[PDB]
Design a protein around this nucleic acid. Structure first.
Ligand SMILES: [Mg+2]
Ligand SMILES: [Mg+2]
Ligand SMILES: [Mg+2]
Ligand SMILES: [Mg+2]
Ligand SMILES: [Mg+2]
Ligand SMILES: [Mg+2]
Ligand SMILES: [Mg+2]
Ligand SMILES: [Mg+2]
Ligand SMILES: [Mg+2]
Ligand SMILES: [Mg+2]
Ligand SMILES: [Mg+2]
Ligand SMILES: [Mg+2]
Ligand SMILES: [Mg+2]
Ligand SMILES: [Mg+2]
Ligand SMILES: [Mg+2]
Ligand SMILES: [Mg+2]
Ligand SMILES: [Mg+2]
Ligand SMILES: [Mg+2]
Ligand SMILES: [Mg+2]
Ligand SMILES: [Mg+2]
Ligand SMILES: [Mg+2]
Ligand SMILES: [Mg+2]
Ligand SMILES: [Mg+2]
Ligand SMILES: [Mg+2]
Ligand SMILES: [Mg+2]
Ligand SMILES: [Mg+2]
Ligand SMILES: [Mg+2]
Ligand SMILES: [Mg+2]
Ligand SMILES: [Mg+2]
Ligand SMILES: [Mg+2]
Ligand SMILES: [Mg+2]
Ligand SMILES: [Mg+2]
Ligand SMILES: [Mg+2]
Ligand SMILES: [Mg+2]
Ligand SMILES: [Mg+2]
Ligand SMILES: [Mg+2]
Ligand SMILES: [Mg+2]
Ligand SMILES: [Mg+2]
Ligand SMILES: [Mg+2]
Ligand SMILES: [Mg+2]
Ligand SMILES: [Mg+2]
Ligand SMILES: [Mg+2]
Ligand SMILES: [Mg+2]
Ligand SMILES: [Mg+2]
Ligand SMILES: [Mg+2]
Ligand SMILES: [Mg+2]
Ligand SMILES: [Mg+2]
Ligand SMILES: [Mg+2]
Ligand SMILES: [Mg+2]
Ligand SMILES: [Mg+2]
Ligand SMILES: [Mg+2]
Ligand SMILES: [Mg+2]
Ligand SMILES: [Mg+2]
Ligand SMILES: [Mg+2]
Ligand SMILES: [Mg+2]
Ligand SMILES: [Mg+2]
Ligand SMILES: [Mg+2]
Ligand SMILES: [Mg+2]
Ligand SMILES: [Mg+2]
Ligand SMILES: [Mg+2]
Ligand SMILES: [Mg+2]
Ligand SMILES: [Mg+2]
Ligand SMILES: [Mg+2]
Ligand SMILES: [Mg+2]
Ligand SMILES: [Mg+2]
Ligand SMILES: [Mg+2]
Ligand SMILES: [Mg+2]
Ligand SMILES: [Mg+2]
Ligand SMILES: [Mg+2]
Ligand SMILES: [Mg+2]
Ligand SMILES: [Mg+2]
Ligand SMILES: [Mg+2]
Ligand SMILES: [Mg+2]
Ligand SMILES: [Mg+2]
Ligand SMILES: [Mg+2]
Ligand SMILES: [Mg+2]
Ligand SMILES: [Mg+2]
Ligand SMILES: [Mg+2]
Ligand SMILES: [Mg+2]
Ligand SMILES: [Mg+2]
Ligand SMILES: [Mg+2]
Ligand SMILES: [Mg+2]
Ligand SMILES: [Mg+2]
Ligand SMILES: [Mg+2]
Ligand SMILES: [Mg+2]
Ligand SMILES: [Mg+2]
Ligand SMILES: [Mg+2]
Ligand SMILES: [Mg+2]
Ligand SMILES: [Mg+2]
Ligand SMILES: [Mg+2]
Ligand SMILES: [Mg+2]
Ligand SMILES: [Mg+2]
Ligand SMILES: [Mg+2]
Ligand SMILES: [Mg+2]
Ligand SMILES: [Mg+2]
Ligand SMILES: [Mg+2]
Ligand SMILES: [Mg+2]
Ligand SMILES: [Mg+2]
Ligand SMILES: [Mg+2]
Ligand SMILES: [Mg+2]
Ligand SMILES: [Mg+2]
Ligand SMILES: [Mg+2]
Ligand SMILES: [Mg+2]
Ligand SMILES: [Mg+2]
Ligand SMILES: [Mg+2]
Ligand SMILES: [Mg+2]
Ligand SMILES: [Mg+2]
Ligand SMILES: [Mg+2]
Ligand SMILES: [Mg+2]
Ligand SMILES: [Mg+2]
Ligand SMILES: [Mg+2]
Ligand SMILES: [Mg+2]
Ligand SMILES: [Mg+2]
Ligand SMILES: [Mg+2]
Ligand SMILES: [Mg+2]
Ligand SMILES: [Mg+2]
Ligand SMILES: [Mg+2]
Ligand SMILES: [Mg+2]
Ligand SMILES: [Mg+2]
Ligand SMILES: [Mg+2]
Ligand SMILES: [Mg+2]
Ligand SMILES: [Mg+2]
Ligand SMILES: [Mg+2]
Ligand SMILES: [Mg+2]
Ligand SMILES: [Mg+2]
Ligand SMILES: [Mg+2]
Ligand SMILES: [Mg+2]
Ligand SMILES: [Mg+2]
Ligand SMILES: [Mg+2]
Ligand SMILES: [Mg+2]
Ligand SMILES: [Mg+2]
Ligand SMILES: [Mg+2]
Ligand SMILES: [Mg+2]
Ligand SMILES: [Mg+2]
Ligand SMILES: [Mg+2]
Ligand SMILES: [Mg+2]
Ligand SMILES: [Mg+2]
Ligand SMILES: [Mg+2]
Ligand SMILES: [Mg+2]
Ligand SMILES: [Mg+2]
Ligand SMILES: [Mg+2]
Ligand SMILES: [Mg+2]
Ligand SMILES: [Mg+2]
Ligand SMILES: [Mg+2]
Ligand SMILES: [Mg+2]
Ligand SMILES: [Mg+2]
Ligand SMILES: [Mg+2]
Ligand SMILES: [Mg+2]
Ligand SMILES: [Mg+2]
Ligand SMILES: [Mg+2]
Ligand SMILES: [Mg+2]
Ligand SMILES: [Mg+2]
Ligand SMILES: [Mg+2]
Ligand SMILES: [Mg+2]
Ligand SMILES: [Mg+2]
Ligand SMILES: [Mg+2]
Ligand SMILES: [Mg+2]
Ligand SMILES: [Mg+2]
Ligand SMILES: [Mg+2]
Ligand SMILES: [Mg+2]
Ligand SMILES: [Mg+2]
Ligand SMILES: [Mg+2]
Ligand SMILES: [Mg+2]
Ligand SMILES: [Mg+2]
Ligand SMILES: [Mg+2]
Ligand SMILES: [Mg+2]
Ligand SMILES: [Mg+2]
Ligand SMILES: [Mg+2]
Ligand SMILES: [Mg+2]
Ligand SMILES: [Mg+2]
Ligand SMILES: [Mg+2]
Ligand SMILES: [Mg+2]
Ligand SMILES: [Mg+2]
Ligand SMILES: [Mg+2]
Ligand SMILES: [Mg+2]
Ligand SMILES: [Mg+2]
Ligand SMILES: [Mg+2]
Ligand SMILES: [Mg+2]
Ligand SMILES: [Mg+2]
Ligand SMILES: [Mg+2]
Ligand SMILES: [Mg+2]
Ligand SMILES: [Mg+2]
Ligand SMILES: [Mg+2]
Ligand SMILES: [Mg+2]
Ligand SMILES: [Mg+2]
Ligand SMILES: [Mg+2]
Ligand SMILES: [Mg+2]
Ligand SMILES: [Mg+2]
Ligand SMILES: [Mg+2]
Ligand SMILES: [Mg+2]
Ligand SMILES: [Mg+2]
Ligand SMILES: [Mg+2]
Ligand SMILES: [Mg+2]
Ligand SMILES: [Mg+2]
Ligand SMILES: [Mg+2]
Ligand SMILES: [Mg+2]
Ligand SMILES: [Mg+2]
Ligand SMILES: [Mg+2]
Ligand SMILES: [Mg+2]
Ligand SMILES: [Mg+2]
Ligand SMILES: [Mg+2]
Ligand SMILES: [Mg+2]
Ligand SMILES: [Mg+2]
Ligand SMILES: [Mg+2]
Ligand SMILES: [Mg+2]
Ligand SMILES: [Mg+2]
Ligand SMILES: [Mg+2]
Ligand SMILES: [Mg+2]
Ligand SMILES: [Mg+2]
Ligand SMILES: [Mg+2]
Ligand SMILES: [Mg+2]
Ligand SMILES: [Mg+2]
Ligand SMILES: [Mg+2]
Ligand SMILES: [Mg+2]
Ligand SMILES: [Mg+2]
Ligand SMILES: [Mg+2]
Ligand SMILES: [Mg+2]
Ligand SMILES: [Mg+2]
Ligand SMILES: [Mg+2]
Ligand SMILES: [Mg+2]
Ligand SMILES: [Mg+2]
Ligand SMILES: [Mg+2]
Ligand SMILES: [Mg+2]
Ligand SMILES: [Mg+2]
Ligand SMILES: [Mg+2]
Ligand SMILES: [Mg+2]
Ligand SMILES: [Mg+2]
Ligand SMILES: [Mg+2]
Ligand SMILES: [Mg+2]
Ligand SMILES: [Mg+2]
Ligand SMILES: [Mg+2]
Ligand SMILES: [Mg+2]
Ligand SMILES: [Mg+2]
Ligand SMILES: [Mg+2]
Ligand SMILES: [Mg+2]
Ligand SMILES: [Mg+2]
Ligand SMILES: [Mg+2]
Ligand SMILES: [Mg+2]
Ligand SMILES: [Mg+2]
Ligand SMILES: [Mg+2]
Ligand SMILES: [Mg+2]
Ligand SMILES: [Mg+2]
Ligand SMILES: [Mg+2]
Ligand SMILES: [Mg+2]
Ligand SMILES: [Mg+2]
Ligand SMILES: [Mg+2]
Ligand SMILES: [Mg+2]
Ligand SMILES: [Mg+2]
Ligand SMILES: [Mg+2]
Ligand SMILES: [Mg+2]
Ligand SMILES: [Mg+2]
Ligand SMILES: [Mg+2]
Ligand SMILES: [Mg+2]
Ligand SMILES: [Mg+2]
Ligand SMILES: [Mg+2]
Ligand SMILES: [Mg+2]
Ligand SMILES: [Mg+2]
Ligand SMILES: [Mg+2]
Ligand SMILES: [Mg+2]
Ligand SMILES: [Mg+2]
Ligand SMILES: [Mg+2]
Ligand SMILES: [Mg+2]
Ligand SMILES: [Mg+2]
Ligand SMILES: [Mg+2]
Lengths: 48, 275
RNA sequence: UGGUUCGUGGAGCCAUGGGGGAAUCUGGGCGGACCACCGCCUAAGGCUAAGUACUCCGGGUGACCGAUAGCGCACCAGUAC
RNA sequence: GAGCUAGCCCUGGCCAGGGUGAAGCUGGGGUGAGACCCAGUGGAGGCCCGAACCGGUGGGGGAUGCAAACCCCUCGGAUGA
RNA sequence: GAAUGCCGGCAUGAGUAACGAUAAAGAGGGUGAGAAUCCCUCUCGCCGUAAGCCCAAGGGUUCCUACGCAAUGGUCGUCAGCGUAGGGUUAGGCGGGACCUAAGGUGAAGCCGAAAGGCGUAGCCGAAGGGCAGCCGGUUAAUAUUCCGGCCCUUCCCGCAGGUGCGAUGGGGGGACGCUCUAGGCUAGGGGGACCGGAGCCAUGGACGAGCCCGGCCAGAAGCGCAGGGUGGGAGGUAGGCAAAUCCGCCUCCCAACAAGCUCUGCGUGGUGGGGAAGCCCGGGUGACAACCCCCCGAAGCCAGGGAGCCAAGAAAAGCCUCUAAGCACAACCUGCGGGAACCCGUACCGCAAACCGACACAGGUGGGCGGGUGCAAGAGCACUCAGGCGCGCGGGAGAACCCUCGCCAAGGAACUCUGCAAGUUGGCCCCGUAACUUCGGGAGAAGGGGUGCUCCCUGGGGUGAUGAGCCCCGGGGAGCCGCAGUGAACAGGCUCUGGCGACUGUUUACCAAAAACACAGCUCUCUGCGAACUCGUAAGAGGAGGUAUAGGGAGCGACGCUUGCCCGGUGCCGGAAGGUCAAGGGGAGGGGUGCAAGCCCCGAACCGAAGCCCCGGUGAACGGCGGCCGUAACUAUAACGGUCCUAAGGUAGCGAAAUUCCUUGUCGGGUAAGUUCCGACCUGCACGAAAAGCGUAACGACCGGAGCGCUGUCUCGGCGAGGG
RNA sequence: CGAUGUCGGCUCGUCGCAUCCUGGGGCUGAAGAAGGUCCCAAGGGUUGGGCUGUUCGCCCAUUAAAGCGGCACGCGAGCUG
RNA sequence: UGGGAGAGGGUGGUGGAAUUCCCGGAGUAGCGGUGAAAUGCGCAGAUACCGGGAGGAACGCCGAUGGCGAAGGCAGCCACCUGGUCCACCCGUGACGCUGAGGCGCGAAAGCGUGGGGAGCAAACCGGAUUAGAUACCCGGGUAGUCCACGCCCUAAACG
RNA sequence: CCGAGGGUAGGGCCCGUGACUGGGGCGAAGUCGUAACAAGGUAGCUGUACCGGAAGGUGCGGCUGGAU
């Protein structure tokens, strides 16, 4: 049947993207935390 | 007159439709329509604030002239009478000798080809508009302003009207559609005659589908819900109300008056509505 | 109403959201209701090192660990997944 | 977190074929004029039968499955909320 | 040594289950260390509204070639979507951007919020919508509307020539719109040809034939032709389209008007460029100087912004045209022609799937287009089959029980069982014929029955032609032939009688309930006079509504028919300027601390002092409620009648052992040989009853009861057979 | 209670005997035939249907007879539900 | 052809008295009702009086034993539209007539449907009396309805 | 071919009968009240409508076949 992951690149970038996170207080705290942890990727990589 | 159908479906047995007999033109003036942004009953937060709205037929909004004292002394010809999906009354397209075209709401008995005009000097005939000072006591009227130059507010739906009952100083006394008696400022404009399409209220939708065409989604009784949802919710099997009948938000709904008491307009309302 | 040890208590002191509303030393605040006496102090402008805190970083040293321990990672780890 | 799901909003798309034959219209009849009746025309409808499409009625199978809801047979809607 | 402890390792179950659709395989030849599994050939089967082809998501080198087989592959492997390496994606015209706007998002001005932030007209961003210039063919191992070939086209810059009051982010036009149905003429696509081109074939009894088999086109500027779309012209006045206007709108006049004319698209033609089958021969040659023509069918596509009807009344903005404003009128713009200029990103491959979502090379899920032929009434249904693609990544045997899916069955025919659960029966089309009841639509495909193939002969109307033949479509009548059987295979209702509940089509517990539940038109109560009530938000701001009492909110009830009684003492709601109670505050009689004092400070009586409550009324489609006992009539029985306690008042009409009845399988009647169920009655209703509506009601229901006919392996009662295990 | 699945039906039995029938007996208010009552006896047998989920029971038509109990109210890693 | 009388019918308008309600004023201890009473209403200011407003229905006098119509039935006043009928002239037509089974139309009140309107009155209903009792007669309240439009119903002591 | 009739199926009319139910007639020796005939103690009768144990009542409109 139809499952939960229906990939959509524009949706991905617009929802979890770098400019999405930076627009908002909680989104920058995500970036601060992910940078503090040493994550190689601060944000999901969608091909574009 | 309203039009019936033969019972060739279970819904056509009861469906009735407006005959549309006064309508002389089936397309709207392109310069007077604009898109009507459908809300679905949702507000600027995205939240439902009026339940069970949405899904109706697409509509363009006809720009109506609810001021009329714009063009004192300038006569206009009644060029057409049109359907308006945004209101129960019909609309009439006016052709001012100015060259300017405007929509008013069509009074009862308005004739295409006749002339109307607005102003303190207008004759007391259907379609003309005057400040209330100059309309004779007893004449029935519509598209009444509430305050001067703020636009027609009262008696706007199909078949409705108000009656001038007398004068008192700077104000005239109107019997509003609801039966209320109200002072209204004499400089407020009005339009002589009743609103047209008085058969509007004899329409029988006939089927659930018809309501849906109009943007009315199904209504859910509180008694069919659960206690999380509604005061009337829950109960094992069916259940009487078991408390004073209440809205989804807990307030009582059988008689509880809700007009604010200290409202400044009370100094102008003589007698609360009848019936 | 808050702060203080003070939770309405005899409840002062310091702060102030509302109302009323002064004086310039013979002016004014405080000494735990309040009054007198006796003292202390100078509100409604601002600044000021040092002694104090912390440990991303550098070093020194362990009756600290020794690869299931010690940091999640001694190794290409905030990786693979 | 509404890329699942629920509702709404904007903008596009889809619905083989067959059946029934409403109003209206034209003609004829009728009448003082009408109502109305008959025929032809017509093509209405949360109309009918049935694929796509949307479903999930009863049974059987499956049950460390092909599958964390599937398969076969049957069955509901299919111009409409 | 134990914590169903934690991490790791290794056992048991066990050579067991399984190896992922029952579309299916066999042989020969090759390669190789090794072959059921790789390559090649022949034979067989399966899909063909797909299991074929194209496009968009998503995936991201999986594409091509060489060399490999440790692992990955449910076996094997020499093979591969795997390992290594090299190569491969070419655009002014295709898609997106240097254009437009939609919801929405953002957001100068502005507004609001302790902070963070929330809003917000314009503007901007935002597409699969508007707009915009490329078709056919060839070529690579792998790209092609991109390279090449032929023929076309767009914008920008500059110049030349003619022309004009030129000029805009401003004004106006236009862009610009629904659903259903549909005309004319075309194109796509298809069928036939005794005609045109073609390598060949004559088998096994016959045929050298009007034989078989194969193919008989594609693109194309201007011009022309056919078919459609769009659009009236002139003058005069003008106060409106936030300036101006010659434009547009309005009034008037005059010609024109279903015409023509001007313009635009489609189709045909068209210089020109291409393609080109079967067979044969080792993807390529040949066929071939290939031929390339006539007839019929015909779109849901095209002309298109076509036409009609209908109510639920159907985006925006830019491009485009027109008007004028500053300005500028050696400029500028318009038209023609010529040269130059023309950027960025995508393009491989998979794409109903082994490359996407499902941990898997997973019987599941995935939006748009093409989707041939014949026959069956039609069709995208069904059977077979074309092009194209496959035989589903374990096999070989055997022929037990049992299981699964399937076929048949003597006599009986529901006796099975909770229940005909399941499975039979019925089954399309044409004709005949069809009941109660009914809201006059229906019920209805009611029920029930007859016909159905092929052959010859006669014949009627239509379509295309031309009026004819030919082709295609719809029929009619007569006489015959064969079989058990003619929708001869496949796809295709079993029917009726009678209750309950719900009017109806719809909706629901994604994944145990589809229903009598929710919704529904419709009924009533109630609130709301507009800066509405009400909802969201601290607010600003929104929704309501660019609506205005024939409207909007809340509640119950639930088509329709006939109806909806009595109780306002309690609670609710509504009304009541009296009265009672009533907090802060006002007031300050009187009292207290302290001071030598004037004075400072504290307590405090009467009285004044809101809403609310109390109090007085009203109100039931507001919350709710709606009795008991004794007695009485020519036999008994019962009680129309009287008496009496209690209550706010004591259940009306209608219905009743009921979706409600405990006693209960109540009693009586019907149906059955026999009926705890069913239907009809009665009424001592444990414990119906009138909008948590009462009683009915045609039609409707994958709802739940009861009965009958038809027919059956459900059964007496079992047997045999098939295929996958 | 870190789980001992439940009524009824179907299937499959096996056992007890306080015996329903068949076999053997005593008594009889046993003439015969038919019965009554008690004793011995468990080898075998103990039907098909209507109602109801029912066990049970009632009823129909038969029968030599239409027995009663136990086995986790026998039997759901055997089925039904 | 020329005249007449008339509440004959339909549509649109419009006038005054009275009843009730609301507002203002003034005023106070009762009003109302009956055979007599009580319920009811009234110091929360009634009744009685004056001024203002709203609204519905019916039209006093004229009015008669009268007029009109086929019947039912028709009553303020104005206008429009329209029927029947009588009279005088004796002008035209030339028996064109009478009746009338079926048909069609009309048809008081009550009742029905959809919508409006609602002052007064008033079935049902509630209360007070009366009475042996009183589901009545009398009194205080009161919903349909009574009124308007359109569609039904089609009855009568529709009687002379 | 037709064809007595038989068979399957569906309709129409008539008769008998049926748990139970509606009223009607008669009986009369009962219970309740007294609706009509007199102004019958509320003049009566009436079509209709709503209501009540019963006769009946009330509303609306009509008749006199109504006493004074
Ligand atoms: Mg997942
Ligand atoms: Mg999706
Ligand atoms: Mg993905
Ligand atoms: Mg995307
Ligand atoms: Mg996208
Ligand atoms: Mg998206
Ligand atoms: Mg982003
Ligand atoms: Mg990571
Ligand atoms: Mg890195
Ligand atoms: Mg992130
Ligand atoms: Mg009309
Ligand atoms: Mg109708
Ligand atoms: Mg109709
Ligand atoms: Mg009709
Ligand atoms: Mg119906
Ligand atoms: Mg109509
Ligand atoms: Mg109209
Ligand atoms: Mg339109
Ligand atoms: Mg526009
Ligand atoms: Mg709008
Ligand atoms: Mg809006
Ligand atoms: Mg917004
Ligand atoms: Mg938001
Ligand atoms: Mg949000
Ligand atoms: Mg709401
Ligand atoms: Mg809504
Ligand atoms: Mg309208
Ligand atoms: Mg209308
Ligand atoms: Mg209605
Ligand atoms: Mg609508
Ligand atoms: Mg609604
Ligand atoms: Mg509802
Ligand atoms: Mg519920
Ligand atoms: Mg919740
Ligand atoms: Mg709660
Ligand atoms: Mg609650
Ligand atoms: Mg409740
Ligand atoms: Mg409930
Ligand atoms: Mg309850
Ligand atoms: Mg419930
Ligand atoms: Mg209950
Ligand atoms: Mg409930
Ligand atoms: Mg319910
Ligand atoms: Mg309850
Ligand atoms: Mg209730
Ligand atoms: Mg309650
Ligand atoms: Mg106001
Ligand atoms: Mg203390
Ligand atoms: Mg303190
Ligand atoms: Mg302060
Ligand atoms: Mg001092
Ligand atoms: Mg001092
Ligand atoms: Mg101080
Ligand atoms: Mg101090
Ligand atoms: Mg001290
Ligand atoms: Mg000090
Ligand atoms: Mg220092
Ligand atoms: Mg320091
Ligand atoms: Mg150590
Ligand atoms: Mg060490
Ligand atoms: Mg280690
Ligand atoms: Mg470690
Ligand atoms: Mg480290
Ligand atoms: Mg480690
Ligand atoms: Mg690593
Ligand atoms: Mg759209
Ligand atoms: Mg369809
Ligand atoms: Mg027809
Ligand atoms: Mg028509
Ligand atoms: Mg349908
Ligand atoms: Mg249909
Ligand atoms: Mg259908
Ligand atoms: Mg769906
Ligand atoms: Mg199913
Ligand atoms: Mg089945
Ligand atoms: Mg089966
Ligand atoms: Mg199963
Ligand atoms: Mg499972
Ligand atoms: Mg399946
Ligand atoms: Mg299936
Ligand atoms: Mg089916
Ligand atoms: Mg269907
Ligand atoms: Mg269809
Ligand atoms: Mg439908
Ligand atoms: Mg729709
Ligand atoms: Mg131990
Ligand atoms: Mg374990
Ligand atoms: Mg264990
Ligand atoms: Mg462990
Ligand atoms: Mg462990
Ligand atoms: Mg092992
Ligand atoms: Mg073995
Ligand atoms: Mg084993
Ligand atoms: Mg398998
Ligand atoms: Mg091999
Ligand atoms: Mg090998
Ligand atoms: Mg091969
Ligand atoms: Mg991937
Ligand atoms: Mg490639
Ligand atoms: Mg590769
Ligand atoms: Mg390998
Ligand atoms: Mg190997
Ligand atoms: Mg290997
Ligand atoms: Mg492997
Ligand atoms: Mg595998
Ligand atoms: Mg090799
Ligand atoms: Mg592979
Ligand atoms: Mg290479
Ligand atoms: Mg090119
Ligand atoms: Mg550029
Ligand atoms: Mg833009
Ligand atoms: Mg675009
Ligand atoms: Mg393009
Ligand atoms: Mg081209
Ligand atoms: Mg290539
Ligand atoms: Mg438009
Ligand atoms: Mg559009
Ligand atoms: Mg539609
Ligand atoms: Mg056509
Ligand atoms: Mg072509
Ligand atoms: Mg064809
Ligand atoms: Mg031969
Ligand atoms: Mg043509
Ligand atoms: Mg002008
Ligand atoms: Mg062409
Ligand atoms: Mg060739
Ligand atoms: Mg050649
Ligand atoms: Mg040659
Ligand atoms: Mg040749
Ligand atoms: Mg079509
Ligand atoms: Mg059109
Ligand atoms: Mg409408
Ligand atoms: Mg816009
Ligand atoms: Mg200038
Ligand atoms: Mg020009
Ligand atoms: Mg650039
Ligand atoms: Mg690029
Ligand atoms: Mg490419
Ligand atoms: Mg699929
Ligand atoms: Mg596979
Ligand atoms: Mg798959
Ligand atoms: Mg094709
Ligand atoms: Mg067929
Ligand atoms: Mg067919
Ligand atoms: Mg099919
Ligand atoms: Mg074929
Ligand atoms: Mg296979
Ligand atoms: Mg074997
Ligand atoms: Mg199979
Ligand atoms: Mg058999
Ligand atoms: Mg049978
Ligand atoms: Mg039989
Ligand atoms: Mg049954
Ligand atoms: Mg069958
Ligand atoms: Mg069949
Ligand atoms: Mg029948
Ligand atoms: Mg009928
Ligand atoms: Mg129907
Ligand atoms: Mg039937
Ligand atoms: Mg044959
Ligand atoms: Mg056969
Ligand atoms: Mg088949
Ligand atoms: Mg069928
Ligand atoms: Mg059956
Ligand atoms: Mg039936
Ligand atoms: Mg029912
Ligand atoms: Mg239903
Ligand atoms: Mg239901
Ligand atoms: Mg109903
Ligand atoms: Mg309903
Ligand atoms: Mg329904
Ligand atoms: Mg449907
Ligand atoms: Mg479920
Ligand atoms: Mg569930
Ligand atoms: Mg779940
Ligand atoms: Mg669930
Ligand atoms: Mg299920
Ligand atoms: Mg369910
Ligand atoms: Mg269903
Ligand atoms: Mg539900
Ligand atoms: Mg419901
Ligand atoms: Mg109703
Ligand atoms: Mg709130
Ligand atoms: Mg706002
Ligand atoms: Mg708004
Ligand atoms: Mg708005
Ligand atoms: Mg509104
Ligand atoms: Mg409902
Ligand atoms: Mg009926
Ligand atoms: Mg009663
Ligand atoms: Mg009460
Ligand atoms: Mg009360
Ligand atoms: Mg009371
Ligand atoms: Mg209560
Ligand atoms: Mg004092
Ligand atoms: Mg003292
Ligand atoms: Mg009521
Ligand atoms: Mg109570
Ligand atoms: Mg209630
Ligand atoms: Mg007695
Ligand atoms: Mg009762
Ligand atoms: Mg009973
Ligand atoms: Mg019974
Ligand atoms: Mg019942
Ligand atoms: Mg009960
Ligand atoms: Mg009980
Ligand atoms: Mg019972
Ligand atoms: Mg019982
Ligand atoms: Mg019984
Ligand atoms: Mg039963
Ligand atoms: Mg039952
Ligand atoms: Mg009884
Ligand atoms: Mg309820
Ligand atoms: Mg109920
Ligand atoms: Mg249903
Ligand atoms: Mg159903
Ligand atoms: Mg049968
Ligand atoms: Mg069997
Ligand atoms: Mg066999
Ligand atoms: Mg077998
Ligand atoms: Mg086999
Ligand atoms: Mg076998
Ligand atoms: Mg336990
Ligand atoms: Mg355990
Ligand atoms: Mg366990
Ligand atoms: Mg004897
Ligand atoms: Mg013995
Ligand atoms: Mg024995
Ligand atoms: Mg034994
Ligand atoms: Mg039994
Ligand atoms: Mg029993
Ligand atoms: Mg018994
Ligand atoms: Mg015997
Ligand atoms: Mg036992
Ligand atoms: Mg026991
Ligand atoms: Mg027991
Ligand atoms: Mg047991
Ligand atoms: Mg058991
Ligand atoms: Mg089990
Ligand atoms: Mg069991
Ligand atoms: Mg077990
Ligand atoms: Mg066990
Ligand atoms: Mg069972
Ligand atoms: Mg169960
Ligand atoms: Mg007083
Ligand atoms: Mg008189
Ligand atoms: Mg004469
Ligand atoms: Mg009448
Ligand atoms: Mg009447
Ligand atoms: Mg009234
Ligand atoms: Mg009534
Ligand atoms: Mg009524
Ligand atoms: Mg009436
Ligand atoms: Mg008379
Ligand atoms: Mg015979
Ligand atoms: Mg015979
Ligand atoms: Mg009397
Ligand atoms: Mg009497
Ligand atoms: Mg009398
Ligand atoms: Mg009664
Ligand atoms: Mg009584
Ligand atoms: Mg009475
Ligand atoms: Mg009369
Ligand atoms: Mg008399």
């Amino acid at each position: 049947m139809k499952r939960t992951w229906q990939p959509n690149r524009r949706k991905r970038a617009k929802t979890h993207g770098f400019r999405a996170r930076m627009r908002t207080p909680g989104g920058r705290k995500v970036l601060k935390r992910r940078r503090q942890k040493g994550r190689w990727r601060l944000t999901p990589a969608v091909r574009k | 007159a309203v039009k019936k159908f033969k019972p060739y479906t279970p819904s056509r047995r009861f469906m009735t439709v407006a005959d549309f007999s006064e309508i002389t033109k089936t397309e709207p003036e392109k310069s007077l329509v604009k898109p009507l942004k459908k809300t679905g009953g949702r507000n600027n937060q995205g939240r439902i604030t009026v339940r069970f709205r949405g899904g109706g037929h697409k509509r363009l909004y006809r720009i109506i002239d609810f001021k009329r004292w714009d063009k004192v002394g300038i006569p206009a010809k009644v060029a057409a009478i049109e359907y308006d999906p945004n209101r129960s009354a019909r609309i009439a397209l006016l052709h001012y000798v100015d060259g300017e075209k405007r929509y008013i709401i069509a009074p009862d008995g308005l004739q295409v080809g006749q002339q109307v005009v607005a102003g303190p000097d207008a004759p007391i005939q259907v379609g003309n508009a005057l400040p209330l000072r100059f309309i004779p006591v007893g004449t029935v009227v519509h598209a009444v302003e509430l305050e001067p130059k703020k636009g027609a507010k009262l008696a706007r739906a199909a078949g409705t009207s108000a009656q001038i009952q007398g004068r008192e100083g700077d104000y005239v006394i109107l019997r509003l559609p609801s039966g209320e008696l109200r002072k209204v400022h004499g400089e407020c404009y009005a339009t002589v005659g009743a609103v047209g399409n008085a058969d509007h209220k004899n329409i029988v939708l006939g089927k659930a589908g018809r309501s849906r065409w109009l943007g009315r989604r199904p209504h859910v009784r509180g008694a069919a819900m659960n206690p999380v949802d509604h005061p009337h919710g829950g109960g094992e099997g069916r259940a009487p109300r078991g408390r004073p009948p209440a809205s989804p938000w807990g307030w009582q709904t059988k008689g509880l008056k809700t007009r604010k008491r200290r409202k400044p307009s009370s100094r102008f309302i003589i007698a609360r509505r009848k019936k």
